[PDB]
Amino acid sequence: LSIEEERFLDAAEYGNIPVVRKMLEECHSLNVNCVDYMGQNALQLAVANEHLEITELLLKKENLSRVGDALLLAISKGYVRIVEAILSHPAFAEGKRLDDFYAYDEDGTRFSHDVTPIILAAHCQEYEIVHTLLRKGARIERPHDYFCKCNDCNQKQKHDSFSHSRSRINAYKGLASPAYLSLSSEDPVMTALELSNELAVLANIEKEFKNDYKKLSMQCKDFVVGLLDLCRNTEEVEAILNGDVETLQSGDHGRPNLSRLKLAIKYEVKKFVAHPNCQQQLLSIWYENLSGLRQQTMAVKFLVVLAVAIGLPFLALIYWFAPCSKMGKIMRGPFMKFVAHAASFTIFLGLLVMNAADRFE
Amino acid sequence: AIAVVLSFSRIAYILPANESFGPLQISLGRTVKDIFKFMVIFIMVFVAFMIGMFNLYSYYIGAKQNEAFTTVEESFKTLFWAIFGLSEVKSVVINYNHKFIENIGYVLYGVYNVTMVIVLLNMLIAMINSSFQEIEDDADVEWKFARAKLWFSYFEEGRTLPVPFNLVPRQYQKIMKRLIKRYVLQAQIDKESDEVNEGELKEIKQDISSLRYELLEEKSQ
Amino acid sequence: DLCRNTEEVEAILNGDVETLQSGDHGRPNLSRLKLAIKYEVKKFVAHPNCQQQLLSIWYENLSGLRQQTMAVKFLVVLAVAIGLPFLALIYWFAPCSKMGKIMRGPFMKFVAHAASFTIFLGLLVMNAADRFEGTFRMKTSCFSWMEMLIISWVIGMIWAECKEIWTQGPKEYLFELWNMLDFGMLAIFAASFIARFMAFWHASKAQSIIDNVKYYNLARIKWDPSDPQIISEGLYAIAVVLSFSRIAYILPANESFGPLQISLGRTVKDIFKFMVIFIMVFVAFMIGMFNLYSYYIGAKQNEAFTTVEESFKTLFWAIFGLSEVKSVVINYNHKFIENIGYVLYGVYNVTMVIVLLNMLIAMINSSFQ
Amino acid sequence: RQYQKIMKRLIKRYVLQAQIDKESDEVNEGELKEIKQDISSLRYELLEEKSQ
């Protein structure tokens, strides 16, 4: 293997900085792009074993191949310092972000050909790298609808029809990553809910990729739930659960504009609503005027239901004559409405029972 | 009578509100889909045996001691009540001398009972247990969501009267920035809360290797 | 799992497309998939990469039919059942056509066979149309048009099986549950038809003669116990039961009830393993009870434990609770044997209903996990 | 030929993925010890060089 080249690769792989530096300075005939038994050159080995000084020394060398693959490998393994060092290479002067540039050998690429550095960083959930790439304008392309009929999508479908679905699912996996959701959009909760809804919709259409799309929607739901979990005071809780209280008008005289909660229920998040932070607000809304009735026992509430069943005609009579009153405002409470409907159903069942009073015995 | 039965069936609407019987009702309800899925095959086997027994005993309308397998309706009724053990064995005996058809009916009825009471019912029990395991895995959260839906059904300002008497007539941007920063920090900590794996440890071994090479080179000079 | 584009997927699933010739006008030479199925890999085929190719092969010309709902496919099956004679007529006259090429698709073949089976089941149901609501041997023995259609269907099924056993070989064709049950059902159907034909032959000879003729004019109340008509009716009933048992062949295709059927079927082996011991204990108690009550043939209130057949029947129906307790009482003064029988019957019930059945339930749960 | 190229590519990819999945295993006592002995040998070498 041209024992000089084998020694150079051996030094590069195991961080022998002085030997690789002396060879880069004094050889003048060493093949820099020579590969080992696995087709990995010095740069790929140095990136793989996380050697920063060797990486910088090789980057200063020109005509160095496998630089895009080196960046991709560094991103996939974290290595934030190495990623930043590679990004300073002239090939990435804000122009190569998001062919044959990312190939790791003569034939093929290390990852899927559609996986750009931003998509790979989102997949691996490297917050520093995702933030860096976003600052450099890297964006995931938000693939088109499943039934899109445009020329580009049609050509992609008729060409391979299997790389197309894989590219679509990779783009969605990048979009649905918590890191990209948190660092990309200005309204991460709303965007996460919308993306979860879209992925849930697409889960039914594609039978083969049903598990993957459901998993991505679950990731979006997990992001929303975790974002809710970190709230500490009622202001943050309202911001997460309700949204922008300035642009959104008040739901009622004292309601917190539950529009986003309705949207979350419609999207079957199932855990952004069941969270205790949402549970306390929902309970507070449930008992608007019955502040002291919350601490009563179950028997007390059963007695209240029976009393409402007894006095339902009186409540109906006083509702029309007095719209606003000490009792009238209480009756408008959601819990009082539920109790009234339940008591009405109890009265109906009692009427059904007593309709056959002539033959009980 | 049927409407009274359905009205009392409607009583389960408000039971999710109670904490004592809400999650229990949700857990029982999540099994009904699997029960229906099994009942499809149950009805298939039922139709099989019903048509077989009806074709066997169609001619002996008067020879039979009872009218169990004379008509399609009677065969359906007899095989349905055989599930609960309310159908006797005398529904196979024939007053005529022919023991061939009587023993064929005995064998078919025994096979039906073995398939239904022993095999199918036990497999239904196993299916219900297997479903109820994963149902219990997430019972609390599902009950919470159901109760939230029940609350949101009443949060609207539209209906106030019951069924009787019904007939008559910026800062937000700051908070989001703060919460996103907090989430980034917490996600990084939770990632740090993962177990070390071979690759991670190797990256450290290569550090020491490069450090050794640098130090030995400096010592040589 | 590592394949990314369709070229790699074909290379892994099919092999060398150059050395291997094309399977058909557009088939990917599924020889390696056949080898993988024969070797019971069970996961190289169930992988989504293989699943997408198999689905694409499944719908060759029905590109738009994949996105239809289950109700739409059921309607398609019903329409194919209605139009099967038209499809058969157009297959011979036009080998290649817009509809003819569609009919050659594997999914269309499966739908056609399923619809044919639905037609056969409907014929079986409607063969007894004379007594759905409720209810001279020459008239009885003659065949009807429905009977002739059923006979033709049975002959077609038998010939199809014969073709399969010829194209697979004795051993290959045999070791298969569907093949084993389809042979039994067809044999019983053929036996019923042969018995009916023998009865018709005797009736035809009696009518040709126009003593030896008085017997064939007797009513059903005075028929011979070994009459071919009775045997034919019993065999026909059992064959109908087996034909409806055959309906589970196409249920694996459905996603709703496929995995459920497979899961239930995987328990049958353990059920049989337990039933062996169940039958052992059953034989134990049956022989004990038969030896106990053999002598009191007339003293007993009923004939429950008088003979081996009666003891077997009583103990079998005791499993489902359909056997009473009066089968132990004896009209004689001897309470020793009566109480011995009471104790033995109680021990049998405790062993079967309580112990063995609950242990069977536990075994089924452990397997189903 | 084309099939040989595809097989070579897929085998290389499988080797890389298998190595990564092996790296995805938990560190165990033996593995960590091999690292401790590195530091030990490095310390001996450095102290010897300091002594000279």
Ligand SMILES: CC(C)CCC[C@@H](C)[C@H]1CC[C@H]2[C@@H]3CC=C4C[C@@H](OC(=O)CCC(=O)O)CC[C@]4(C)[C@H]3CC[C@]12C
């Ligand atoms: C009283 C007995 C003899 C007959 C009962 C028949 C009905 C009158 C029962 C059946 C179901 C009962 C209802 C089911 C449960 C509830 C929820 C309960 O509210 C709670 O569970 C407390 C927690 C909360 O309100 O948030 C109020 C009573 C109510 C409507 C019950 C009222 C009485 C009902 C209608």
Ligand SMILES: CC(C)CCC[C@@H](C)[C@H]1CC[C@H]2[C@@H]3CC=C4C[C@@H](OC(=O)CCC(=O)O)CC[C@]4(C)[C@H]3CC[C@]12C
């Ligand atoms: C699993 C399947 C596909 C195998 C085929 C099953 C049949 C060939 C078996 C099953 C039940 C058997 C029947 C059950 C018991 C009897 C009782 C027996 O009736 C008599 O005693 C004859 C009348 C007389 O006593 O004179 C006649 C044989 C017969 C019908 C048997 C004939 C053979 C049958 C139909």
Ligand SMILES: CC(C)CCC[C@@H](C)[C@H]1CC[C@H]2[C@@H]3CC=C4C[C@@H](OC(=O)CCC(=O)O)CC[C@]4(C)[C@H]3CC[C@]12C
């Ligand atoms: C896969 C298929 C093609 C197998 C077919 C097998 C049949 C050709 C054989 C097997 C069992 C035979 C049957 C066994 C029993 C009878 C009962 C027999 O009727 C009687 O018992 C009358 C006796 C009497 O009158 O005394 C009529 C012939 C038949 C149908 C036999 C006809 C020929 C059968 C159907």
Ligand SMILES: CC(C)CCC[C@@H](C)[C@H]1CC[C@H]2[C@@H]3CC=C4C[C@@H](OC(=O)CCC(=O)O)CC[C@]4(C)[C@H]3CC[C@]12C
């Ligand atoms: C209609 C009811 C009242 C009586 C039903 C009796 C038969 C006519 C049923 C019983 C089982 C049914 C079959 C079982 C399931 C299927 C598979 C089904 O195909 C699918 O599951 C869709 C997915 C796919 O085809 O790949 C097509 C209908 C079919 C043959 C069904 C056709 C109608 C069958 C034969």
Ligand SMILES: CC(C)CCC[C@@H](C)[C@H]1CC[C@H]2[C@@H]3CC=C4C[C@@H](OC(=O)CCC(=O)O)CC[C@]4(C)[C@H]3CC[C@]12C
């Ligand atoms: C676990 C095994 C190996 C232990 C042995 C069991 C037998 C020795 C036991 C079990 C049931 C017992 C029998 C059950 C009850 C009775 C009823 C009893 O009948 C009478 O009342 C006598 C008649 C009269 O009243 O004058 C006679 C004893 C006897 C047969 C018992 C005798 C002793 C038996 C056979």
Ligand SMILES: C[C@@H]1C[C@H](C)CN(C(=O)c2csc(Nc3ccc4c(c3)OCO4)n2)C1
């Ligand atoms: C999944 C569970 C299954 C059970 C039905 C109990 N389940 C309740 O929660 C429940 C409590 S009272 C009631 N009402 C009712 C009355 C008559 C009924 C009926 C329901 O179904 C058929 O006939 N249902 C749900």
Ligand SMILES: C[C@@H]1C[C@H](C)CN(C(=O)c2csc(Nc3ccc4c(c3)OCO4)n2)C1
């Ligand atoms: C493992 C499961 C056990 C059950 C039998 C249901 N199983 C089906 O999947 C099924 C649906 S219809 C049908 N046909 C049928 C009819 C009469 C039958 C019989 C089978 O076995 C004995 O008598 N079998 C398989």
Ligand SMILES: [Ca+2]
């Ligand atoms: Ca780790």
Ligand SMILES: [Ca+2]
């Ligand atoms: Ca390093």
Ligand SMILES: [Ca+2]
């Ligand atoms: Ca076959």
Ligand SMILES: [Ca+2]
């Ligand atoms: Ca390890």
Ligand SMILES: [Zn+2]
């Ligand atoms: Zn497009």
